[PDB]
Coordinates of C-alpha atoms and ligand atoms in Angstrom, one line a residue:
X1 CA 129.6 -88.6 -109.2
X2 CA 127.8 -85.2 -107.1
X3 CA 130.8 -83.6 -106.2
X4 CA 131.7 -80.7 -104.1
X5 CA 131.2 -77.0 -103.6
X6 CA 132.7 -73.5 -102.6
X7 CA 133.0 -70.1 -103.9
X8 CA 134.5 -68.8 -106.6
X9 CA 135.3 -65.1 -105.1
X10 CA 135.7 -63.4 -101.9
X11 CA 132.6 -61.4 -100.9
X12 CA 131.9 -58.7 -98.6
X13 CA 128.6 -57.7 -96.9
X14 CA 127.7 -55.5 -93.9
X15 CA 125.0 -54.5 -90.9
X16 CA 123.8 -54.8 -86.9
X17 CA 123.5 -57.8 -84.6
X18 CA 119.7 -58.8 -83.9
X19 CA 120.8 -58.9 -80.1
X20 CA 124.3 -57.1 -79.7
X21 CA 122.9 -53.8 -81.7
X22 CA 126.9 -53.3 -83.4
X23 CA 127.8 -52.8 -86.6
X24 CA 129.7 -55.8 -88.1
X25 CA 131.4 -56.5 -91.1
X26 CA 131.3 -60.1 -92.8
X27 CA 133.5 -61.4 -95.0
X28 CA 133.3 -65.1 -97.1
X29 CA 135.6 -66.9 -99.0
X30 CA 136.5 -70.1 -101.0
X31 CA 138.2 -73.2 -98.8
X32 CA 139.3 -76.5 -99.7
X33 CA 138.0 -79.8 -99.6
X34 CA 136.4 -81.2 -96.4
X35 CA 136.8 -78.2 -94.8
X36 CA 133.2 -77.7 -94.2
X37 CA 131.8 -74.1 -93.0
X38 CA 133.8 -72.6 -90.8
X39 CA 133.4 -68.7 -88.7
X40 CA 136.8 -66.5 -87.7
X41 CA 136.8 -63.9 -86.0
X42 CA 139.2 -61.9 -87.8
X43 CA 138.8 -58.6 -85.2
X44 CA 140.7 -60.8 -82.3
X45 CA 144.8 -61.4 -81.9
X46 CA 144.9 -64.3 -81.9
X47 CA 142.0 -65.1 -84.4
X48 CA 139.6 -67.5 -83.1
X49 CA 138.1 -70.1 -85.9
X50 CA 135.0 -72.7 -85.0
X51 CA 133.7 -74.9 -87.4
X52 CA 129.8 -75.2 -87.9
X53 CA 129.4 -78.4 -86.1
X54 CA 126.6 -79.2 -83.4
X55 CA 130.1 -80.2 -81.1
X56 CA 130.7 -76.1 -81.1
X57 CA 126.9 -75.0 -79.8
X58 CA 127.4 -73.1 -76.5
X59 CA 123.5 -71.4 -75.7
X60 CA 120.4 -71.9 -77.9
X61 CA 118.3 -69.5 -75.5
X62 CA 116.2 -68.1 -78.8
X63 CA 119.8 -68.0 -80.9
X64 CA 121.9 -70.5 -82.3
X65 CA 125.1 -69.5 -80.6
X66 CA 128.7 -71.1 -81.5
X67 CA 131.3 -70.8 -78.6
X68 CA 135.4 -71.9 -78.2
X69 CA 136.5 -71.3 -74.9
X70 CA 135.7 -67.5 -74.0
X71 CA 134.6 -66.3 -77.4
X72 CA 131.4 -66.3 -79.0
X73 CA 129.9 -66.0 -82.6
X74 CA 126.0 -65.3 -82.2
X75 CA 122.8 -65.9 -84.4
X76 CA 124.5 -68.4 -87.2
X77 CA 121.3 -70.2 -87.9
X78 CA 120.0 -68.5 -91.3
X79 CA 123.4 -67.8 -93.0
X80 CA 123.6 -71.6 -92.9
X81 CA 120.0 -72.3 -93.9
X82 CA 121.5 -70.6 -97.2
X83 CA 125.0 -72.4 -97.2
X84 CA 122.2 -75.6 -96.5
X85 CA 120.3 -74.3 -99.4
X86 CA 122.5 -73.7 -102.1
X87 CA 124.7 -76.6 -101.3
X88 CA 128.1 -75.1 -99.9
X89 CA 129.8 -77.8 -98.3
X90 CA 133.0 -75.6 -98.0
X91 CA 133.3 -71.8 -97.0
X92 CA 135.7 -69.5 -94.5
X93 CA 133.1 -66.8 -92.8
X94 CA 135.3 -64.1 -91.2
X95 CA 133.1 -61.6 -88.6
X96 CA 134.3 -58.3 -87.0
X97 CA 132.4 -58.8 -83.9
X98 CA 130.4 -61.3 -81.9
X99 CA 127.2 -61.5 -83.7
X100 CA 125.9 -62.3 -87.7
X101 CA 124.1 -59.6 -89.0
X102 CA 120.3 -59.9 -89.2
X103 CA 120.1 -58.1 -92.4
X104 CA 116.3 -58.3 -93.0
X105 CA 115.9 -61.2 -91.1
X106 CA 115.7 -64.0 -93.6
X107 CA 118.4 -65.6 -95.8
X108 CA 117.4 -63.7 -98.5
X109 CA 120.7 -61.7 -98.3
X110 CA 122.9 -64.3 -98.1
X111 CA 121.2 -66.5 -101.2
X112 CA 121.7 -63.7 -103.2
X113 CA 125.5 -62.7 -102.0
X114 CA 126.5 -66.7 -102.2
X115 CA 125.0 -66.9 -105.9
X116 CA 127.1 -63.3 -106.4
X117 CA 130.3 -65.5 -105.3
X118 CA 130.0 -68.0 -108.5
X119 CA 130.0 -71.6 -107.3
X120 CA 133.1 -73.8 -107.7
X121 CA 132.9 -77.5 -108.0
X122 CA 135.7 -79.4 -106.7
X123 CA 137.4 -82.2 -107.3
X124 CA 136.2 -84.2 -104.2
X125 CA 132.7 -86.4 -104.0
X126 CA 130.1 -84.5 -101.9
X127 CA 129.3 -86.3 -98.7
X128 CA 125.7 -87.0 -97.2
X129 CA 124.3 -88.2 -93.8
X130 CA 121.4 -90.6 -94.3
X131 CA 119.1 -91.5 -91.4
X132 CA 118.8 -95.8 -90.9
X133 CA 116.5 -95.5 -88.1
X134 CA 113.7 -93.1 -86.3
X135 CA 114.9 -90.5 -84.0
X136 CA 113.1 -88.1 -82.0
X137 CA 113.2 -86.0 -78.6
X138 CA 110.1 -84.9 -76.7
X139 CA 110.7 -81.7 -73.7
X140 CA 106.6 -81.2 -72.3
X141 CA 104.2 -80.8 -75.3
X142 CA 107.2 -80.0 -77.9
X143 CA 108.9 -82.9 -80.1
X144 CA 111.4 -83.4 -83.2
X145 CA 112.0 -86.2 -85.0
X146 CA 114.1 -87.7 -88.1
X147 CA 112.9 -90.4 -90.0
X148 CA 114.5 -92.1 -92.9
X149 CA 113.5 -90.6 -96.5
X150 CA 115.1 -91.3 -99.9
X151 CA 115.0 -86.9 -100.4
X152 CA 115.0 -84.1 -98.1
X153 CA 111.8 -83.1 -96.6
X154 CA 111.0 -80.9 -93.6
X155 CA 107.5 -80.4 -91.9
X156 CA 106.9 -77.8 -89.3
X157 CA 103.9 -76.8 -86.7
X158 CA 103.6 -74.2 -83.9
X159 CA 100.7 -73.5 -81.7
X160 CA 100.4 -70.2 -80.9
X161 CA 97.1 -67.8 -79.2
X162 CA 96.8 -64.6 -81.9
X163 CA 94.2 -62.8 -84.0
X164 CA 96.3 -63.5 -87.1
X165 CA 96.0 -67.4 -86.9
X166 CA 92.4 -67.0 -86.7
X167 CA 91.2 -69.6 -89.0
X168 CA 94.8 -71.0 -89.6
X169 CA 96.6 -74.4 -89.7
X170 CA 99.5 -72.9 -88.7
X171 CA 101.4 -75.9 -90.2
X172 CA 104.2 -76.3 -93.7
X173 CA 105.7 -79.2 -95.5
X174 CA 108.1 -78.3 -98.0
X175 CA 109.7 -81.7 -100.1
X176 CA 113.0 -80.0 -101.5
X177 CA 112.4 -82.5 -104.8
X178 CA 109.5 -80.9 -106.2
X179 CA 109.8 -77.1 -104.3
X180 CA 112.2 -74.5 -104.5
X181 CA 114.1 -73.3 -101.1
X182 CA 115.4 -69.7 -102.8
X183 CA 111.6 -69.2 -103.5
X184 CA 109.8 -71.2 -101.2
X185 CA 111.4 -70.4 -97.9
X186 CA 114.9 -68.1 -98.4
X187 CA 112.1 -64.8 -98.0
X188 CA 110.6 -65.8 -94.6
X189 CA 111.3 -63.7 -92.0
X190 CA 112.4 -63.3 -88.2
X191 CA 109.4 -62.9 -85.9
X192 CA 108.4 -61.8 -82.4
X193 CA 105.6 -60.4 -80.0
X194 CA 105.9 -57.1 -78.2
X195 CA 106.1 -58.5 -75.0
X196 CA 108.7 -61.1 -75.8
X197 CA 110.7 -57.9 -77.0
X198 CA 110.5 -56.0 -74.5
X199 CA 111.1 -58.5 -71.6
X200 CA 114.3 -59.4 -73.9
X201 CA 115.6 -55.3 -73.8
X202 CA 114.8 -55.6 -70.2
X203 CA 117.9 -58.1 -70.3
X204 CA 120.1 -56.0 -72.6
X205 CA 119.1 -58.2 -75.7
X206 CA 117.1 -57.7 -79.0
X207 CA 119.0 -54.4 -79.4
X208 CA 119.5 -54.5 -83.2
X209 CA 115.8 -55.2 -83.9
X210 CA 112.7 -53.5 -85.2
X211 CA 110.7 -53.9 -88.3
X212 CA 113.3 -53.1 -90.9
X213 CA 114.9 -56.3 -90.0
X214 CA 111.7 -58.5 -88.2
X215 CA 107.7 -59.1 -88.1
X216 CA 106.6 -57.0 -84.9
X217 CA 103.1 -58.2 -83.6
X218 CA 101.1 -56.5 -81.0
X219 CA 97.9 -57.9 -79.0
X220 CA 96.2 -56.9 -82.3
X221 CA 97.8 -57.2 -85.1
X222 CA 101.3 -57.1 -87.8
X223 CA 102.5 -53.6 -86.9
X224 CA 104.8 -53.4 -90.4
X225 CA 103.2 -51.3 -92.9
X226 CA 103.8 -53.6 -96.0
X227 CA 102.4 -56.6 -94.4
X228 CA 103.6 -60.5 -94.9
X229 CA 105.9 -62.4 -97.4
X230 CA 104.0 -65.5 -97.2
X231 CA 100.2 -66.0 -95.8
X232 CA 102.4 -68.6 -93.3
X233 CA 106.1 -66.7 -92.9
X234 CA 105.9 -67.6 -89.2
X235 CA 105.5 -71.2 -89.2
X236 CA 107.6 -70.9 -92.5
X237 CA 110.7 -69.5 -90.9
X238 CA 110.6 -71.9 -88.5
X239 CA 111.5 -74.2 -91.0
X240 CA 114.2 -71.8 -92.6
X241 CA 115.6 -72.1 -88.6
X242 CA 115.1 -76.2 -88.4
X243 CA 117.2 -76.0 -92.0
X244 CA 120.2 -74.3 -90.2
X245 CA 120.1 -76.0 -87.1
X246 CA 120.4 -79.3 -89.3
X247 CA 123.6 -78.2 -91.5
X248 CA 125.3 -78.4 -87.9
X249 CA 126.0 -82.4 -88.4
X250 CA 128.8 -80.8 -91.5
X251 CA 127.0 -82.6 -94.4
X252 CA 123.8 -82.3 -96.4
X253 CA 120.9 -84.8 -95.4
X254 CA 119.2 -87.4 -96.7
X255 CA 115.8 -88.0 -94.6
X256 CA 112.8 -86.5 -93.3
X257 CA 112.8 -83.7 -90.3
X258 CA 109.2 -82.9 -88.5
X259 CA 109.2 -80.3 -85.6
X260 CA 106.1 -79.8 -83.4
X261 CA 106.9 -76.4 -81.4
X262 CA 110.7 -77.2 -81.4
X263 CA 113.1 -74.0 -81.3
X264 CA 116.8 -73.8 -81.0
X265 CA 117.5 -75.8 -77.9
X266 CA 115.3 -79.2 -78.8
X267 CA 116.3 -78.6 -82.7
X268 CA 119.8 -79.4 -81.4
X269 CA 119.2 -82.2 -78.4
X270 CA 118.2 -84.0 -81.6
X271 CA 121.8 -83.9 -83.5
X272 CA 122.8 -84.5 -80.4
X273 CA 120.8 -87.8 -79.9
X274 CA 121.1 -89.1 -83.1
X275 CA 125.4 -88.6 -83.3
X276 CA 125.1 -90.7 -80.3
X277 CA 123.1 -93.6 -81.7
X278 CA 125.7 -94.5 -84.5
X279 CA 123.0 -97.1 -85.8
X280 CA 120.6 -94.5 -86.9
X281 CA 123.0 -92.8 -89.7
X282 CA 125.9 -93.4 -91.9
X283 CA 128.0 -91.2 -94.1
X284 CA 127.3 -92.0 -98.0
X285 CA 128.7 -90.7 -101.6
X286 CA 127.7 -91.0 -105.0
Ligands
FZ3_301 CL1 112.4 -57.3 -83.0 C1 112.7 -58.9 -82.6 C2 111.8 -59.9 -82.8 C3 112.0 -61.2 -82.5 C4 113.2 -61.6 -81.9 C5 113.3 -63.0 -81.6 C6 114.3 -63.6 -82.5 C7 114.2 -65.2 -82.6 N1 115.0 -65.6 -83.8 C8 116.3 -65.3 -84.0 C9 116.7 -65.8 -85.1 N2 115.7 -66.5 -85.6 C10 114.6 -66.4 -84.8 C11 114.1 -60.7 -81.6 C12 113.9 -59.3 -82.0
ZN302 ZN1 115.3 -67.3 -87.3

């Protein structure tokens, strides 16, 4: 059988939220069977703890934000694109404030910290959720879809007006068979537009960010210095999002995911939609 998977040791990592602008510490550790991935915040009495399940998701308003009741943890979406990527059904993630930290705005960080942790294999068989049936979601010109698949395969387009896609598909399939995620994807990073930045710190957000930790573009051009990761890390890290926002059903996937101009709020109508239609999936094991 494909069994199941945690840590072997605790790890420690640290750095500023993308929109809060504090310094946070993060801690993970090993958990048991079935527990899935789960965040604590460990700087509240009592400490609050909310799994990572699409049931949790409070705003998707250009985050991934899980709420319980009055208290928030912000920005989950890439740490999870590496617990999605390296297979860690199981993991405790204990925060000392509100938000993840960006770190350099890919899961790059958190590949390489998980991989520092060992991996455990436990004595459990690893559970999958298989798509039966085509499901999709369509808000104006913007759509996502899941259709069945014997792998895991996820296809991605935006359609953005810039210099830099001059010439430019703007468009990524990555088949998680015959490519690797840690080299592939884990690198892409976190991107935005100088007026989409600055009508965010208009509204007390983006306060962590600038291009130590994100891709600045102006009506010209890449403003960082050492240029791109990828000749397509924007379309590319939309994937790395999509990946996250997927690990929010608990279990790894077996299907095929295609966004066209999807962010965080469609990306998660679409767990949404499918969980609903109980036809469309089932839970399987080897
Ligand atoms: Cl500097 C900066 C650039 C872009 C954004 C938008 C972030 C959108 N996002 C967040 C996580 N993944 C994508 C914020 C600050
Ligand atoms: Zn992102």
């Amino acid at each position: 059988m494909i069994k199941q998977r945690t840590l072997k040791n605790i790890i420690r990592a640290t750095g500023v939220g993308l929109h809060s602008g504090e310094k946070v510490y993060l801690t993970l550790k090993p958990a048991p069977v079935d527990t899935g991935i789960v965040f604590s915040r460990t700087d509240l009495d009592p400490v609050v703890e909310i799994p990572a399940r699409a049931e949790n998701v409070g705003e998707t308003t250009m985050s991934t934000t899980l709420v319980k009741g009055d208290v928030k943890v912000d920005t989950v979406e890439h740490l999870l694109s590496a617990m999605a990527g390296l297979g860690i059904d199981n993991a405790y993630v204990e925060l000392s404030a509100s938000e993840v930290p960006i770190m350099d705005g890919s899961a790059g960080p958190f590949v390489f910290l998980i991989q520092s942790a060992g991996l455990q294999e436990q004595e459990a068989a690893k559970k999958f959720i298989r798509i039966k049936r085509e499901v999709s979601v369509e808000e104006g010109d913007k759509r996502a879809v899941f259709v069945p698949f014997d792998g895991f395969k996820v296809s991605f387009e935006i359609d953005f007006d810039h210099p830099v896609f001059r010439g430019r598909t703007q468009q990524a399939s990555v088949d998680f068979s015959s490519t690797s995620f840690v080299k592939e994807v884990s690198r892409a990073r976190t991107f935005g537009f100088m007026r989409d930045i600055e009508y965010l710190r208009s509204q007390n957000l983006a306060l962590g960010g600038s291009v130590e930790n994100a891709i600045v573009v102006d009506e010209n051009r890449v403003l960082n210095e050492d240029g791109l990761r990828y000749e397509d890390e924007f379309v590319k890290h939309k994937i790395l999002d999509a990946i996250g926002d997927l690990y929010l059903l608990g279990n790894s996937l077996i299907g095929e995911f295609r966004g066209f101009k999807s962010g965080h709020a469609l990306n998660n109508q679409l767990l949404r939609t499918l969980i609903a239609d109980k036809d469309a999936w089932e839970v399987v094991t080897f």
